[PDB]
Every structure is written in structure tokens, then in C-alpha cells.
């Protein structure tokens, strides 16, 4: 339907991979910088920061596998294509299609999970890594308590076996996506968002298959993603890529643990700063987020 | 067209300051109050209550807000659906019947009212039996990844209104049937009398009733937990002789060894597992009934 182009001047690319197409907006010139969104959003969440990044970088703003307009690989009982390991492999393959075998990467939310998993699996692929408002999946599950269970209830809700979350999400999908967007902002409403961006999120979320993928992602988040992280924790594997951890002063990551302290256990070279924002750093605090990312990546 | 599942039981609408309590009443002898839980109504006792009625005056009540009991208006603290409030309301209901001292068996939410009744008002109870629960405090305190996945609904249903209400309203039937099925040993509805399922489904079909259940769960995440916390940290133990029954495949045994937990909460607790999922009186009626009769009797 009525979907605004929020990346004027960016091209739109369908990048083929062995697991399906990745949709991306591509703008800018210079070193490649891949931007990955998370839930329940699409690549358009970068629309306020991408132009500023594209002043200095070839900015590739990709829909995650299964999200947005990217193809949805068929899942399996292990949710394999929606594990962050598989998504990272698919995005690596997509970047290779562009000739980008060494790139900068900033991820937000699920996209940040892809990113740090990418950085653990294939750190050679990354010059620099920024993660916005997450802790590693293992840390969320390790710190799981009453308070976090309530706060990130959707981690266990969306990970319920199908079709339970699918059916429930189906009961009022517009409400649910708006409810997630609003409830994780500082304002608590949709006012931080561009209505046209919210329109993108609403439409993607209106598709049952897209919602199923999101549950697949969360199922992976509860199962294989956790196991993969656990392996790294237990082997002492650290991200060797210089990395920036940004978190909302009232985002999700500061609810579980002090994020820079946490990320320092996961990464050898991490800097970090809070942004006066809820979860949606690039939309609630675009100038601050864009500034931090530009300074770090450039 | 809801079946009478208690042939020969009377029906009582018991006035309390907080609304009427519906109950079926049958039998003669010492009063025994049976309290159901979620997402059920008093009819879950229909297989065991006749055996109990051979020896006790059996009062099979709908919890405040459940079944045909009135639905006191909730508030921001979910007060009427805290187990403390529900217990005080059922104390008043029993008082209306002249029962100021009575035996009590509860299942699920009803078990939570029960042990809270026993902590708050121990002198009202001759004996207490709780079925397939641990204290609310213990469930939250043990809320790790595994358990957050198992009883995700503890955090989902406790989300602020109207999020769960809105999701549940799209297809209520699905969710009540899913919960009944998922917590049984068999993982389907075969343990239930279909006429009982229809009671549960009809209750669940009312949005107000569904809201009450969420209010119960909200109370469960907040006030109920706080009240329990006070008691645990104060070393307040239930003094009333108590039977803890749980399903070998039920929920309680997922968190911890139930008897060891209950021994922390109760000075005089005996416990037996029953080969059953969560729905002991329906999955394992003869065994449950025998356990209760034995325990409550001389
Ligand atoms: Cl790993
Ligand atoms: Cl039944």
C-alpha cells in the first residue's frame, strides 16, 4: 500500500543469497557500512540516521532475512535460518554479492544480535561493529528473573511453539506492533516515530508470514542463539572487532545490566555511551545516534 | 446449554462485600471449600467433588471474577484479584454460610488464594490442600530461561492492559483450549469432560472474564509476589496442616522439588505427586480424590 520512500537518493537493491533475497536501500559513497534493524521494524528505522552516515560511507540498509521485503527462508524445527548465526551468514553472502567482504556494521535490536554473532563467527568480515541497545542474548537469558521476565516478556512469549504466538499476534497485529513501538520509547507513545515509518512497520507486521518469521527469530533467540552464545561464553571467545555499544538511557539493555560492563566481557575493544532515548535509538535520538556512529566508524 | 456437572449439588450465590461468589454445594459434614484456577471454573472439580461430598459439605466456588462469580472492578494495583483480596472475599463468603473454620483445597490460582488465605487468616482453616503449585514467590524467584519459557504466560498475562486482553480477544477459544491442552500430561483435551471444556470456553469467551484473568496474573506478578516476599523474608510459615499435591508432569514440579519448597512455607506439610499434568482433579480424579479424602479425613 501507501509506503513512503524515506531514503531519498538511496537505491533499492535485492541482493540474492543462497537463502533468499535481502532487500536493501543503498546510498552514499565510501567504506561500506551495513545497518541492520530489529524487531518489530524494518530497514526504514534507519531513515533518520542513514543520510548522515551516507555522507561518509556506502550505507547499506538491509532488511533482515525474513523481515521487511527480504525473502523469508523456510524455517525448520531448529529455526535455523532465523538463528543469528544463519542470518549473519546470509548477510555476509549478501555483502559479498556487493563485493563487500570487509565492512562496518551497526545493528539495532535483533539486527544487533545478528551483528555480534557475525562478529564472533566471522570477525574478519568486520572493520568495526556497533550494537544499539542490546546485550548478548545469553546475558538476557542468564539474567532472566522476575523483573526481566516482565520487561522482556516477548522473549518468552514469541518463543512459544507455533502457532501460539502467531495466533495471538493475529488477534490484533496493528495494536501489537504499535504497542511494542510505543512501549519501548522514552515517550511511551508513537510520537518519536515518523508516521510513514510506523506505516512500514505496521504493514510488515500485518503479514502473518512476516509475524511467523519474527516468532522464528525469537524461537531461535531462546534456543540455538542462546546455545551459540553459551559456547562463546564458555570458550572465552571475545569479539576482537572494535565495537561501540550504544544503549537508551531507558532502553531495554540498561534494564538487565550496565551494558558497557557486560559488553566488556564479550569484546576486547568496546566503547559505549548511553543515549537519551528509549530502545529505538535511531528514531528517538537520531542526531545523537548518528553523531556517535559517525564518530566511531569514521 | 452448559451442563450441570454436579448432579445433586445445590447452587448458591453468596454475597460478599466484593461481589457474589457462585458455588455449587453438596454433601454433608465438615465444610470443605474447593477453589479452581485458570483458565477454569468451579466445574473442574466435577469428577472429584462427588467423592468428597460423601464425607464433607463440599463448596465448589468460582473464584472472585471467575466463572459466575461477580467481577469486582479492578484497579491499578489489581487489588481484588490479589490472592489476599480473593482470600478475604472467600472468607466472607464462607462466613455467609456459617463456615468460619473450614478445610480448603485449591488448584492453580485457587491454590494461590488458598495458601495466601492460610498465611493471612490461618485460624479459618482446619486443613489446606494445594494442587500443583508452588508459592507465587517461588515461581518468580525461579524464573530462569527454562522456566520463563515454560510459564511464559505468567509474564505475558501480566503485561499492562490491554495488551494480553487485545491479543486474547482475537481468538479466545484457541487460547483457553491451548492452555488446557498444553498443561495436561497428554497435551490435548482428552483428559477433560467436553462438557467441562464448554464451561471453561464459555467463561473465557467473555472479554470481562478474560480481563479478570489478566488482572489475576497482574496481581500474580506484583502484589501477590510482594505479599509472598514479605512472608518468606519474615519466615512466616503456614501453620495449618497442609497437603501439597502436584502432577508429576505438572507445572509446580518444573520449578523445583515441590515438597522441599513447601516445607519452607509450611510447618506441617505432606506432599504426594500424582501421575498427571497440571489438571490433577480432571486428569487424575480418582487419585486426587483419594489423596484429598485421606488428608482431610480422620
Ligand atoms: Cl558459538
Ligand atoms: Cl473434566
UniProtKB/Swiss-Prot annotation, chain A:
Result when mutating residue 184 to F: Reduced catalytic rate. Minor effect on substrate affinity
Site description Important for enzyme activity, residues in chain: 133
Oligomer status and interactors: Homodimer.
Superkingdom of the organism of origin: Bacteria
Signal peptide stretch: none
Keywords, sorted A to Z: Hydrolase
Domain AB hydrolase-1 stretches: 31-269
Function: Catalyzes the hydrolytic defluorination of fluoroacetate to produce glycolate. Has lower activity towards chloroacetate and bromoacetate.
Annotated protein name in UniProt: Fluoroacetate dehalogenase
InterPro entries, per database record: AB_hydrolase_1 (IPR000073), AB_hydrolase_fold (IPR029058), Epox_hydrolase-like (IPR000639)
Effect annotated for changing residue 279 to N: Abolishes hydrolysis of covalent reaction intermediate
Catalytic activity line of the entry: a haloacetate + H2O = a halide anion + glycolate + H(+); fluoroacetate + H2O = fluoride + glycolate + H(+); chloroacetate + H2O = glycolate + chloride + H(+)
Transmembrane intervals: none
Recorded consequence of changing residue 218 to F: Reduced catalytic rate. Minor effect on substrate affinity
First-level EC class: hydrolase
Similarity comment: Belongs to the AB hydrolase superfamily. Epoxide hydrolase family.
Amino acid at each position: 500500500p501507501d509506503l513512503a520512500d524515506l531514503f531519498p537518493g538511496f537505491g533499492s537493491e535485492w541482493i540474492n543469497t543462497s537463502s533468499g533475497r535481502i532487500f536493501a536501500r543503498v546510498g552514499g559513497d565510501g567504506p561500506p557500512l551495513l545497518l541492520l534493524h530489529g524487531f518489530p521494524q524494518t530497514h526504514v528505522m534507519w531513515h533518520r540516521v542513514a543520510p548522515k552516515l551516507a555522507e561518509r560511507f556506502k550505507v547499506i540498509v538491509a532488511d533482515l532475512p525474513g523481515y521487511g521485503w527480504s525473502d523469508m527462508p523456510e524455517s525448520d524445527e531448529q529455526h535455523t535460518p532465523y538463528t543469528k548465526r544463519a542470518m549473519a551468514k546470509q548477510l555476509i553472502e549478501a555483502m559479498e554479492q556487493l563485493g563487500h567482504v570487509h565492512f562496518a556494521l551497526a545493528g539495532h535490536d535483533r539486527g544487533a544480535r545478528v551483528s555480534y554473532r557475525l562478529a564472533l563467527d566471522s570477525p574478519g568480515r568486520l572493520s568495526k561493529l556497533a550494537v544499539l541497545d542490546i546485550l548478548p542474548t545469553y546475558e538476557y537469558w542468564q539474567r532472566m528473573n522476575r523483573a526481566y521476565a516482565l520487561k522482556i516478556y516477548h522473549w518468552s512469549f514469541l518463543a512459544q511453539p507455533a502457532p501460539l504466538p502467531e495466533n495471538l499476534l493475529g488477534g490484533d497485529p496493528d495494536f501489537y506492533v504499535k504497542a511494542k513501538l510505543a512501549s519501548w520509547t522514552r515517550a511511551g507513545d508513537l510520537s518519536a516515530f515518523d508516521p510513514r515509518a510506523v506505516e512500514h512497520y505496521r504493514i510488515a507486521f500485518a503479514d502473518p508470514m512476516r509475524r511467523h518469521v519474527m516468532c522464528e527469530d525469537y524461537r531461535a533467540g531462546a534456543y540455538a542463539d542462546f546455545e551459540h552464545d553459551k559456547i562463546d561464553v564458555e570458550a572465552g571467545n571475545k569479539i576482537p572487532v572494535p565495537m561501540l555499544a550504544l544503549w537508551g538511557a531507558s532502553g531495554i539493555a540498561q534494564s538487565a545490566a550496565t551494558p558497557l560492563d557486560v559488553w566488556r566481557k564479550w569484546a576486547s575493544d568496546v566503547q559505549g555511551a548511553p543515549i537519551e532515548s528509549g530502545h529505538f535509538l535511531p528514531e528517538e535520538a537520531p542526531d545523537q545516534t548518528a553523531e556517535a556512529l559517525v564518530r566511531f566508524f569514521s
